[PDB]
Structures are given as structure tokens and as C-alpha cells.
Design a protein around this ligand. Structure first.
Ligand SMILES: O=C(O)Cc1c[nH]c2ccc(O)cc12
Ligand SMILES: O=C(O)Cc1c[nH]c2ccc(O)cc12
Lengths: 135, 135
């Protein structure tokens, strides 16, 4: 059956199922999905462009702009001129650091049954695919 | 940097980038994303439940119900009693079969740089992850 082996369908189902699990934790800790993606993507990062942030958070750029309006109002991120760059603030980092710990724990549980070899192979393949297909 | 290696972010970016490429082709051939996912998921399949279809198409069940209302009106799918099951009709299969050929061609181009070993490993890992995390 086509869909059983079709790569884009497999990627999309695996992604939705694993992410939905962690999104429950994120909401339990007062975060929306979009807030979690923005703060976790900026944590430990150099300032990046709005376009880069939109790509990594898989969010449309106009949606990201509205999101940054309100996250900047709450002091969690800051927009800078270089093209507009964006960074997480210390307030945002302190707000998200425990959640990032929990995210790493959840990821470890998801990948443990596969073993280190298969887990690293999966992550490397995904990184290579992103770098080939990004615009 | 957290996000560079975080599995759910990697899965979601790879999935969005590869799928967006094929969605362009689907629209060029008169299909919406949701129509493509439903018809391709049902092609060659036994009738499946609305809940199963919602999971495989990564679409919320109420959205799927509205989608099936209009796809059934166009004669592309049919809802049956067993729990409601759903199948593709011959009209729907004829409408989507060429697009499925093009989808297989696009998938082959996406996976060719990785080689058969890495491609099969990726697909097997994704299938195993889906089967572990589905509800
Ligand atoms: O839209 C995409 O590429 C991702 C996707 C998720 N579920 C699907 C089921 C069938 C299909 O053809 C594609 C998909
Ligand atoms: O929401 C998800 O699990 C998927 C996702 C896509 N891009 C992200 C960037 C950072 C992050 O923590 C998660 C994600």
C-alpha cells in the first residue's frame, strides 16, 4: 500500500506523534507550541534572521512576526537590526531552560529503544535532508 | 545549540521541506494537500476507520469529517458502516494515480543521494517510531 512506505507520509506521522507528546508537557508548563519552538530555537544561539527563525520553527513568516510582537512585549525575545535579527533574552532563557531539560529527557526516551547507532544515523540523515532542501 | 540536534525539530523541518516540494506538484495537478493525503492514503487500501484516516493524514478528526463530506459529494470517496469506514472510489483512484506516480518519482530523487541502505534504514526507523507512538 502506497502510504505505508511513502517517505513524506512517514516523516509527517512520526513528527506529529512525537511532537504531540512533548507539546503536552510544554502546555503543562505554561507554553504554547509556538512559544516553545521560538524560545528553544533561540536558546544558546547567535541572533538569527526572521526568515531563519521561520524556517527552523516551521512557522509562516507573517505568523512569526505577530508572535515576535507579543513575545517582545513580554520581554522574552528581542528584535535587532543587522534584515531583522532576533535573539532570546535572559528572561526568555530562564523561562524555557527547565522545559528544555524535560525535552532532552523525552527525546532520550523516544530514542533509547533504537540504540545509539540508529539514533545518530536518523539525526544525521534528517540534518542532511534539511540542509539539502532548505531555501 | 539545542535546536540543531533536537529530534522533534529535525523531524518537523525535514518533513515540511520535502512535503512542500511535492505539494507544489499536487496543486499544479488540481489537488489540495488534504485531498492528496486522503486519496493517496486510501489508494490500494482496505476501508479504514475515520480515526485511522485522521492519524495517517495527520489531520484532526473534525477536519477530516468535513473533508469527507465534500469528497464524498464529488464521488471520490465513500463512507460505509462497519464505527464508520471510508474507502477511495474508482473515480478517486483514477484522479490520483498519475500524481502518485509523480510522488514516487519525487521520493526517489529525495532518497537517491542517501543510497538504498540509508533510505531503507530511515523508512524502517520512521515506521517503527509511528507504530510505537500511535494511539
Ligand atoms: O503531505 C505530505 O506530504 C505529508 C503526509 C502526511 N500524511 C500523508 C498521507 C499521504 C500522503 O500522500 C502524504 C502525507
Ligand atoms: O514542536 C515540535 O516538536 C517541532 C518543532 C519544529 N521546529 C522546532 C523548533 C524547536 C523546537 O523545540 C521544536 C520544534
Amino acid at each position: 500500500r502506497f502510504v505505508d512506505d511513502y517517505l513524506p507520509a512517514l516523516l509527517a506521522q512520526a513528527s506529529q506523534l512525537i511532537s504531540s507528546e512533548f507539546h503536552e508537557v510544554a502546555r503543562q508548563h505554561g507554553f504554547s507550541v509556538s512559544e516553545w519552538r521560538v524560545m528553544a530555537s533561540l536558546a544558546g544561539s547567535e541572533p538569527i534572521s526572521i526568515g531563519q527563525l521561520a524556517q527552523v520553527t516551521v512557522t509562516k513568516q507573517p505568523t512569526v512576526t505577530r508572535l515576535l510582537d507579543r513575545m517582545e512585549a513580554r520581554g522574552q525575545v528581542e528584535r535587532l537590526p543587522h534584515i531583522t535579527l532576533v535573539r532570546i533574552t535572559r528572561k526568555g532563557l530562564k523561562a524555557v531552560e527547565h522545559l528544555m531539560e524535560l525535552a532532552r529527557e523525552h527525546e532520550r526516551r523516544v530514542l533509547e529503544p533504537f540504540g545509539l547507532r540508529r539514533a545518530e544515523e536518523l539525526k544525521q540523515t534528517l540534518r542532511q535532508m534539511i540542509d539539502l532542501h532548505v531555501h
